[PDB]
Design a protein around this ligand. Structure first.
Ligand SMILES: O=C(NC(=O)c1ccc(O)cc1)N[C@@H]1O[C@H](CO)[C@@H](O)[C@H](O)[C@H]1O
Ligand SMILES: O=C(NC(=O)c1ccc(O)cc1)N[C@@H]1O[C@H](CO)[C@@H](O)[C@H](O)[C@H]1O
Ligand SMILES: O=c1[nH]cnc2c1ncn2[C@@H]1O[C@H](COP(=O)(O)O)[C@@H](O)[C@H]1O
Ligand SMILES: O=c1[nH]cnc2c1ncn2[C@@H]1O[C@H](COP(=O)(O)O)[C@@H](O)[C@H]1O
Ligand SMILES: *Cc1c(COP(=O)(O)O)cnc(C)c1O
Ligand SMILES: *Cc1c(COP(=O)(O)O)cnc(C)c1O
Lengths: 805, 805
């Protein structure tokens, strides 16, 4: 396979000797006692060595050229594994494959040993990861800044059909990719009081926590650029004896674990400490670099992108430093701050928005609270001048929300202090301007933008689906890997009998590969000839895994009704983690496994229908299941999924999509053509009209016999014999308080699914439609997304120019 | 200097290239941004590389030959720095010195960057360190097993003349010498209950803590042998969500910090957990290795040495495994256990002996308590049979002590379960048999032995005093470095005018070197021509730093009395850490600094007398001050210092000794000749006669005018103007409840000190006496000590044979 680079004779010879050198000197092992894990580490260190030279000169280059620096602040970076990605970007895959083969090792086996760097929950964290890859590939002087959690997203275990959370001790065996930089440790302050003396305010009597950075290299695609992702780790200062030392933990707990609540905002103190910790340490680094290049030029040399409101404290912290430390006057500092910061929103659902209780900020960050009040005061004076007499607008736009307990709306703070605010899909960005942020849009229209999300074609095509990447390259070259729009050239092959056959062959190979994996590491057997129907993403009511469940039960009931009637065989796979304290989400997981227990053991069904719950869904599993999927389920209620990115991964890998006109689904259908998409359900307008009228689920239950039967089955204990009322909460929610209108889209969903089965019966036409999707997936490359951020927000020009080394 | 090895052309060339390779690939740095610390690490990794090959084959060799293995269990390993020691033992010092010189670096400057591995309190921990060096040098298949404390002995800061404790974060910048071995992690159990079912007892419902090993290489002196020191680190098993993860700390606190109480036993639960933790993990390793070589041969392949009673749980744990797990019958298991274990005692003072409350063992280690009761039962049945009717002997020898709260005497447990029990100096070993362990000696005389302590001549001569090592080698060769008895050949040079001059020259150079250091890193100026009077060791009442203080004040008062009378100039240095909760010890430190504040600023005294308190005494400081000392203070009350080892370090480095006939001082004087030692004070017999009579301090106060004046000065606030009664506790203790009879040895001490000053006035005779001490210090090499342990206790023969690589 040519897209994996050349396997030169002296290159292979060099890799082999460095492999054995590391096994000996680095790992300190005998070839007679080395285990597969030891071999993985020897390979990792060998590949890491190749990154060093490039990493050192890339950073040296930025010091010389002194270009504008882009700082991407995120509390999450869902990186996954690093070995194969590094080989791919350095063009070392075939060489390492040959070198290891000659040493009597299977590189694929070694790659499976690496732990995932799961420092994220899902979409938001993975977007940050794809963005880092694209920024390096486009030659931007970019830095990713976050927290080095000792424990990432929990490993999910399914016990008795229930989710069990297990600590993700990903650093147990060490992390060969990172480099600790203790010499660059910085002070972060907490608590204390604010002294107001003759010349300015002073924040004193604070407790100090040190921030120690760990740097991880981020290689661009074959351009010799290697940027940095710097993650901070918490350390206690060195200044009963025993208890005093043991209490050092308290300070170090700040970077101990990733918060897994991606659905409901909880104003926990530890989370606020994490947010300030990353912001305070990062900003000192930014200013340091700047002073080594008049803060008037600060915005010309620095761009700070806030991934959601999680790092929003960057705004008042920048003000604190400029005003309290650098001594700039307020107006000047505010000008600099606004021109430097930009904010990206990822959801319109209210329960996820950060609204911190004032009493918490009052105790932990007294000076920042004062700064926020001043910002609010000046901002509202602006609103009052623009909309005289509109007192209600004043209360609505305030950064401070009154009521039971006063809270600070962090989204309002971000809009006021950013020169750009963006949604992540066209429909989402429009909804922001028409609803949630309407008042702000009317005040400052120029600030609102759209930047449709994307995914990196390196990890999501070349790395996880080499077979498809190869057959594509055979016909249009390899240039598309860094210019995905070139995939449009494949439309001229839609009638090519050879190509149609190859596309279908690779998909079949991926399905057999995954079906085998399912038995090896999970002992479950599936029919490779069935349609692989998959929905993988975090469990949320808005994502409607429940609607999928209703269809599965419908299919099952129809079979029990007419057993000898032919139906297209299906393997329905659903996977995803539920936030620990999200009761309903945990009940849905139990429902899925319960359905499987019934369906998978019914003799009449045979191998015509299988329901499997994919355990511990994470980046490394996504790389395995996505290339094997036939049907991608993207069925969120219209207006709820900001963008979605998994949808893009499926489109690029040869799966057809069944979904609502929500998030990026709208743009995907626009690019490929609605005829090549399985669209169904209410549009956003329909949802609003239903809300005006009032959603009454009982209506659908009374008019749809098939739906009624399912609800009765759930209620009577058909799927829970030993515990008849096990799913009472689910039924109760669907019937009386379903914010996401599951029943409203049921009929159209089922009908649409029938059209999917009909097309699958015609192999040739199914594949031709697949080609039309792959061919038009170009717009969804994160390289396109990053280019827009660069030109329209950060003010820099991307570069595909190879670096000097 | 020839004893530093050869600096070959291609050897130097190789070191240089590997140095730059590590700076680039390992540290990931620019030569334009590298700091001294970066250079130190590059050098360390370069030297470490040379250890690897030898380390791997040494361990491979033991697997092949399968010799009897020696396991040295200690909760303390006071290692100090590792770089220079490694170079010395590998004969790479001159080569590295040349290589670094050519790179434009000063190797001495780089060596000062390394942190000390301070995993010990003092003598006991440092003995373990010297023992590891000697066992490797003598070719024994030995393993050091302990705990990898994240925080070693605290760094001592002197604030306002008071000791302040600062956490010793020695791993902050990383430890290049160790190699984590997560793949060899083992389970350690705590709490739980004991089930008694049909076939044997069962320990169930326990809480598990994992023990992760870290291995550090221990190189022998130029024999290519590299043994291992394996230190265990505590890890929590992976099986509110957030709080559950944060609570993992609780389990990991076991290996967090070294207990600094080397004076008073405190039955703290955390300390007991540490003791079992090291024992449980170590024993699994021992058995594993054994089964890979009938437990009847266990004692022929394994020897376990217990450094004090700290790891005494090894006895009942070995029984637990043999009986409960391997299913051996009690008597057989006990036979194996006794033949495998040996115990070393380090003190006769009662407050330091471990006597664990039964209720603590009952909760934490229920099965071990049962085993201890059974051991006690069977042991006492033996005593009853040997001494029929002696009921009092029964209560005295019991492992269980009655009273307020029942406790387990760990020393009694060690004697019952060991085939050998030894003291650490002849006088100490005799005292054990006549007093503290008299009953046990009468029951089993064959178990009691003596093994006089020693120090390694590599670190304590070659490494810290190259100048002296060189002038010695010039005349008798270099063979003495691994056969210290050869120093006796120097007696033929006692009248050699050339040698006398060189010995005196090196001492003068060391004093100027130390005097300079005192100003550089401490800004205090001293007179290099004065007699360097030094007492460095942990602060304890029994060590009598107070007696030294009384002499200093006496000297000061005599000068104020006759200012224009000539007196031999002196620089009195006292250093050492005080256990955190040892009030009296902390008061003595304050007293020393207070005396300095007065004496050091008195115009009349001039540079005739200076009192300096050496801050943060530790191994690296000992290596600096000892070679610069003229007079070694070893003045413990006769019968209290088991052996002492600092005394041996001073003797080997050209200092004369003033001390009591206590511990090893007795043997040192015997070897060098009493005429070449400044002996004074009560012998052990005198102390007992005084106790019979009753020690009344008032008697000395009334009969000695000079002493009375000092006490009155302390009481009146002469040394504490602002706080007149600051030292009331000290005076009160000296006058009414001094267990160590400070006043009783005052007169003889002062008189002896006068004879010291008299000899110092005759440079030539002082030096000749010095030569007689150095020449007879051979017996105190730890190589001699280890050879005796090997032959008389472990049953193995030492070997000076170079290894094959
Ligand atoms: O993944 C998240 N959000 C979180 O994971 C999250 C984590 C911690 C929180 O406190 C709140 C949300 N949002 C997701 O970010 C993706 C990239 O823009 C979008 O495509 C998805 O539509 C959106 O739901
Ligand atoms: O150093 C100690 N003891 C401790 O450091 C200690 C540490 C923790 C404890 O719980 C009790 C004692 N003992 C010392 O061990 C040396 C080597 O045998 C002897 O030469 C000294 O005379 C003796 O006092
Ligand atoms: O003062 C300096 N002199 C020379 N090079 C420097 C200096 N400061 C930074 N650099 C270079 O710039 C890189 C960027 O470091 P950073 O951005 O501060 O982490 C460093 O690794 C050096 O190559
Ligand atoms: O099963 C085995 N086969 C070959 N060599 C072994 C085996 N077990 C241990 N060794 C060798 O013995 C050394 C001792 O390992 P340890 O004493 O168990 O830590 C290992 O590094 C290997 O060189
Ligand atoms: C791409 C990805 C996501 C986001 O999926 P959506 O379906 O857009 O919610 C979540 N988790 C993982 C591991 C991913 O790879
Ligand atoms: C040798 C040594 C000791 C033991 O000294 P003694 O005088 O025998 O108590 C204590 N601390 C350090 C750092 C040592 O090097």
């Amino acid at each position: 396979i040519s897209v994996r680079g050349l396997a030169g004779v002296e290159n292979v010879t060099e890799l082999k000797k460095n492999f054995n050198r590391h096994l000996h000197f680095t790992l300190v092992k005998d070839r007679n006692v080395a285990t597969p894990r030891d071999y993985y580490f020897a390979l990792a260190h060998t590949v890491r060595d190749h990154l060093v030279g490039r990493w050192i000169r890339t950073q040296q280059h930025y010091y010389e050229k002194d270009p504008k620096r882009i700082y991407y602040l995120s509390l999450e970076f869902y990186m996954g594994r690093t070995l194969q990605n590094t080989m791919v970007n350095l063009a070392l895959e075939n060489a390492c494959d040959e070198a290891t083969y000659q040493l009597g090792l299977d590189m694929e086996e070694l790659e499976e040993i690496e732990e995932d760097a799961g420092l994220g929950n899902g979409g938001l964290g993975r977007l940050a990861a794809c963005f880092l890859d694209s920024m390096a590939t486009l030659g931007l002087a970019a830095y990713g800044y976050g927290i080095r959690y000792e424990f990432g997203i929990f490993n999910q275990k399914i016990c008795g059909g229930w989710q069990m959370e297990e600590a993700d001790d990903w650093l147990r065996y060490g992390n060969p990719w990172e480099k600790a930089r203790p010499e660059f440790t910085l002070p972060v302050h907490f608590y204390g009081r604010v002294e107001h003396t003759s010349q300015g305010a002073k924040w004193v009597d604070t407790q100090v926590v040190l921030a120690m950075p760990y740097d991880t290299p981020v290689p661009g695609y074959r351009n010799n650029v290697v940027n940095t992702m710097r993650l901070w780790s918490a350390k206690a200062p060195n200044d009963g004896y025993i208890q005093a030392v043991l209490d050092r933990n308290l300070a170090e707990n700040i970077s101990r674990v990733l918060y897994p609540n991606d659905n409901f905002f909880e104003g926990k103190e530890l989370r606020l400490k994490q947010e300030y910790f990353v912001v305070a340490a990062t900003l000192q680094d930014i200013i340091r670099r700047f002073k080594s290049s008049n803060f008037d030029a600060f915005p010309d040399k620095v761009a700070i992108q806030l991934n959601d409101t999680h790092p929003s404290l960057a705004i008042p912290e920048l003000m604190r430093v400029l005003v309290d430390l650098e001594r700039l006057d307020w107006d000047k500092a505010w000008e600099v701050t606004v021109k430097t910061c930009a904010y990206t929103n990822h959801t319109v659902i209210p329960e996820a928005l950060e609204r911190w209780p004032v009493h918490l900020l009052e105790t932990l960050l007294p000076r920042h609270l004062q700064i926020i009040y001043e910002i609010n005061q000046r901002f509202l004076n602006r609103v009052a001048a623009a909309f005289p007499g509109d007192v209600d607008r004043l209360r609505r736009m305030s950064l401070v929300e009154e009521g039971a307990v006063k809270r600070i709306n962090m989204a309002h703070l971000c809009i006021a202090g950013s020169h750009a605010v963006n949604g992540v899909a066209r429909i989402h960005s429009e909804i922001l301007k028409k609803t949630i942020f309407k008042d702000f849009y009317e005040l400052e229209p120029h600030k609102f933008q759209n930047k449709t999300n994307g995914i990196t074609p390196r990890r999501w095509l070349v790395l996880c689906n080499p077979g498809l990447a190869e057959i594509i390259a055979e016909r249009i070259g390899e240039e598309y890997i860094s210019d995905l729009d070139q995939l449009r050239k494949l439309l001229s092959y839609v009638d090519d009998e050879a190509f149609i056959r190859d596309v279908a062959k690779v998909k079949q190979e991926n399905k057999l590969k995954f079906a085998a994996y399912l038995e090896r590491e999970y002992k479950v057997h599936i029919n490779p000839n069935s349609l692989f129907d998959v929905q993988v993403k975090r469990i949320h009511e808005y994502k409607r895994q429940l609607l999928n469940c209703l269809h599965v039960i419908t299919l099952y009931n129809r079979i029990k009704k007419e057993p000898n009637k032919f139906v297209v065989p299906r393997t329905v796979m659903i996977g995803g983690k539920a936030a620990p304290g999200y009761h309903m989400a945990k009940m849905i997981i139990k429902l899925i496994t319960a359905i499987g227990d019934v369906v998978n053991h019914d003799p009449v069904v045979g191998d015509r229908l299988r329901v499997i719950f994919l355990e511990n869904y994470r980046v490394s599993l996504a790389e395995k299941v996505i290339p094997a999927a036939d049907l991608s389920e993207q069925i969120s209620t219209a207006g709820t999924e900001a963008s979605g990115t998994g949808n893009m991964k499926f489109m690029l890998n040869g799966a057809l999509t069944i979904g609502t006109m929500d998030g990026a689904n709208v743009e995907m259908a626009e690019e490929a053509g609605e005829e090549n998409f399985f669209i169904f359900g209410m549009r956003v307008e329909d949802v609003d009209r239903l809300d005006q009228r009032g959603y009454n689920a009982q209506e659908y239950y009374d008019r749809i016999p098939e739906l009624r039967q399912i609800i009765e089955q759930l209620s009577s204990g058909f799927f829970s014999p030993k515990q008849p009322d096990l799913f009472k909460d689910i039924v109760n929610m669907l019937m009386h308080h379903d914010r996401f209108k599951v029943f409203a889209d049921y009929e159209e969903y089922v009908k649409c699914q029938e059209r999917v089965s009909a097309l699958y019966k015609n192999p040739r036409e199914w594949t031709r439609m697949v080609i039309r999707n792959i061919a038009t997936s170009g717009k969804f490359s994160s390289d396109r997304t990053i280019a827009q951020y660069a030109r329209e927000i950060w003010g820099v020009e991307p570069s595909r120019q190879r670096l000097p080394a």
